[PDB]
Amino acid sequence: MKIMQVEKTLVSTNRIADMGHKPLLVVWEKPGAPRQVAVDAIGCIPGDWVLCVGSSAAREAAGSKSYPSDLTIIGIIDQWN
Amino acid sequence: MKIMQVEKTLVSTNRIADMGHKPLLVVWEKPGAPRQVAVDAIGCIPGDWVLCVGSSAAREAAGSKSYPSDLTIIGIIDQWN
Amino acid sequence: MKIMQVEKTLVSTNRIADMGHKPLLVVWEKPGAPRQVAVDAIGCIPGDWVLCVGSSAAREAAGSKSYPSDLTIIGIIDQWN
Amino acid sequence: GIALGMIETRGLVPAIEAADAMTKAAEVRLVGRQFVGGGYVTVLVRGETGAVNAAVRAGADACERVGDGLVAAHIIARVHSEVENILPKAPQ
Amino acid sequence: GIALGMIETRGLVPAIEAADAMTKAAEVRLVGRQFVGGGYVTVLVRGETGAVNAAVRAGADACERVGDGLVAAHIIARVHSEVENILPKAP
């Protein structure tokens, strides 16, 4: 897992069909860090700190054995600075 | 595998259901290194040096073929500086 | 694959059960590089240069479809500087 | 730190394992190890509600296998003031 | 209040849950937790008859599934003055 902060919501209209209805958020470690897009499986407002899982586990975290994803948010950190 | 040191315990109440009852710890190589969260399958007090496995092996190390994890602690180093 | 040099032997008594009897070695690219632990499937004395495989291939290189490993040594380089 | 976590086990080895698992899993304070008698050992913790919940879940999962097993694993998010009189504050 | 309510449970966790649910459900006064021995744990309260009845009912319904379970739940409206000698005053 990997701790990241939600920046903003990202929308792609021409995304492939098997991506489903799941939303996408832009997450970075800190302001100025390289930006990555993670499939949102919990629901996070911009600003909070979330847990991001990668690799084959992210596909299951999205919801399916064969979901086209590589970084999925699995939870919101209760307390974090 | 990858040698890391346990920093502190991390708790997320809104974590997804299939994460089970397994605890989570914050692990880094050294004070000041980037922080990562690893599923604890052994039980480590903060401070000690542990073995962390990644990728698809971490899912089995957690306990299931389809556990949503990407970094799992598999053992505690006996002697390490 | 990824070329590394064996540094020293690492022993963890509280390692999980499914790790089997396989030994572990500490491998780095060069003195001073970040250190990683690799499951030894060949047998290497400290000092020599070895081939290290990662990801899902390392699990098979260890010996099982579901071996908890992410970096396995698959051979010893004949000649290397 | 007001929530209370409880785990009961048949024997002292599973109780110690549960207490260690909870303390390692979350930031909680172990307040009491009680010898109920007849083989029952109870371990109590205090802390913030979510931390106590996570610790109790992890401890139950860890100590279910060892020993004679589990008896109870219960979390109380708001202990009544009157009940606090029967809750130990320091382990013996 | 003089009415006495008591629940016996096979463990300490069900006893704590029973006492907590009792005191939250009704405005009664917890007077003691007793380790009978052999696993039985008892909790006792004092208060008005209706409050004690409501508290004991809630506690017996809340401790039914937690832990090893429920052993007994009883209410005495007016206990004899002799039983005060063995009834604890504070826990």
Next chain:
Amino acid sequence: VTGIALGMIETRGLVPAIEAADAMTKAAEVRLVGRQFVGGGYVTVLVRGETGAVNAAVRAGADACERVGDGLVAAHIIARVHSEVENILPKAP
């Protein structure tokens, strides 16, 4: 009490809704921020607080109100509520 987490319980009728609200407030350290008459019999009670406190409160309330009256319709939990939803979420009852 602080926190932004929101706990929702929907019951068919007012008696189960009141029972659920009482059970939630007694079980955890939450805030009763409103009761809503949806129409058609649905009644919704909302609680605010910390995430774990809201979790315990909602679980206890659903368990308590699942039997009284017509029953329980829904019991949902929201960790962080969007600022826009705060417009439609009532502040006080």
Next chain:
Amino acid sequence: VTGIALGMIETRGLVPAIEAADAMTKAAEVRLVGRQFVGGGYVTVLVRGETGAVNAAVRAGADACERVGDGLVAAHIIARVHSEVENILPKAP
């Protein structure tokens, strides 16, 4: 002897517990830090030392005491013990 690892063996009765303690202390280089009467017949013996020493000690003790008396109930090993658990773990017998 040094180390923080903890080894636990639980037996039904005192004779198997004594046998297990003797077997552990003879097999490995550990420290007998206490014997506890749980109640109901359970008796617990605790050993401290290095991780590997505790592993060997606990294995040998379980193997030795599994037959004598009522038998063996539990045999568990803890690599690092949390500081809070040290309050409930006895220091000396």
Next chain:
Amino acid sequence: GIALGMIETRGLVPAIEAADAMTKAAEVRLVGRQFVGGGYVTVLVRGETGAVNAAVRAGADACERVGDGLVAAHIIARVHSEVENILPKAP
């Protein structure tokens, strides 16, 4: 003597009978009677290896039918120095 002999019985009467028969049968030294809890009672002796063996055999044969019966009977020829810390010296 260093050898340790012990018998566990389900009751106090079989334990007393075992200790009495033990001390009468062999010249050993009774060092303690322990109430384990749950009904188990243990008696311990010290002495030479042969004397301890004879005493324990006699005690296990004498306490077999008295009371609830016999739980266990064990002999340790040379107990480790660590176990002396938990072994009682006098009853």
Next chain:
Amino acid sequence: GIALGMIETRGLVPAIEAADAMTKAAEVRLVGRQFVGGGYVTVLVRGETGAVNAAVRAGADACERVGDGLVAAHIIARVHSEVENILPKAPQ
């Protein structure tokens, strides 16, 4: 007064009944009532051999019916000197 009489019962009511029966039957001194734990209660007496034998027989016969019943009823005509160290001298 050197012989020792023993009776074990499951519960305290049969133990009291047995002790009363023995003391009434023969001239013996009740030395100890022991709570073994787990429901076992043991009563000990001292006296001349025949008196202790008669008292033990009468007590066993009397307290067999009451309560959960008998566990043991044993007479020792000559207690070893070493054994005396574990025999209580005054009831508590």
Next chain:
Amino acid sequence: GIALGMIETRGLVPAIEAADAMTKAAEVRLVGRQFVGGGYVTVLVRGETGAVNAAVRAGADACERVGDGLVAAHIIARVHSEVENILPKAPQ
């Protein structure tokens, strides 16, 4: 360095393979290669308990396949002082 590791094999090739595997797996000192006679070859190592355990496990696993196979693989965490008189200190 007090723990002792032992591996016995039917033949010298599996014994050499086992010794190499143990020495590569853990930080141990190979003290003796013994020709028991009749085809048995034994290799002994000394070191800290956990290291010796890991080395013995790895050596047994590695040399099980090669040659006529394994005979024994045993770890002693505390060798008695008297036993040390029959344990060789330097290989020949």
Next chain:
Amino acid sequence: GIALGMIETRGLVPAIEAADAMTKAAEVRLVGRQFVGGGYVTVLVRGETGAVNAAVRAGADACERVGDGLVAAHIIARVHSEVENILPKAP
């Protein structure tokens, strides 16, 4: 001590385990390890009769499963003076 205890094992690992368990279980003196040839290995001890008996029993129970197994375990209470000539004094 004069009593002689001996165990023969089919291998050196069971012999070492037998000797170790023997010396730990009883306060005896290990006097020699002999390679008979053909795989048999023998260990010998001296001491009191009871100590030797306990040691040999423990060694025979500890070497039973380790390695190829156990061949024989014998105790001689008082060996003849002639056998001292072939009995080793030190290993």
Next chain:
Amino acid sequence: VTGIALGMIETRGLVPAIEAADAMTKAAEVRLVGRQFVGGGYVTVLVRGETGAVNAAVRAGADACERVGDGLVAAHIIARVHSEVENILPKAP
């Protein structure tokens, strides 16, 4: 010849061992560093050299000696030999 790789062939008897040693030394560029009488009939021959040379030598020797006499018991190859094992490995025959 240089190198630290070790090649081992174990045969039941001396004739197959000699045949295997001759076949190895003729097939590859290795060094015959010793012949050992294990006892019970086992005889072991050891060769040193480069890794590939040792590989070819051991393969050829096993193939040649698999039939003569009682047969072939083991044929193993070690790329790098630990310094401790060099104590028990003979230097010259």
Next chain:
Amino acid sequence: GIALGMIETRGLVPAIEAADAMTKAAEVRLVGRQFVGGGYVTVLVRGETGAVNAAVRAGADACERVGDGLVAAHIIARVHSEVENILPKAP
């Protein structure tokens, strides 16, 4: 030594064989041969507990087939002071 070992045989030849094997097997002291009458012959020894046990076992195994056979073989670790009055001191 205080331990007493005894074997009864149906004849004098088995008794002599038992006593001889006993004294050769363990360093005990033969104290008497008694003609019970009716064919029974008894031999008695004194010594340490372990030595007496070994001697009696060897004698019972050696007199089993010789003559009419073996009647009984017993060991008493510590005989009461009263029995010394009937126990012979020398044969």
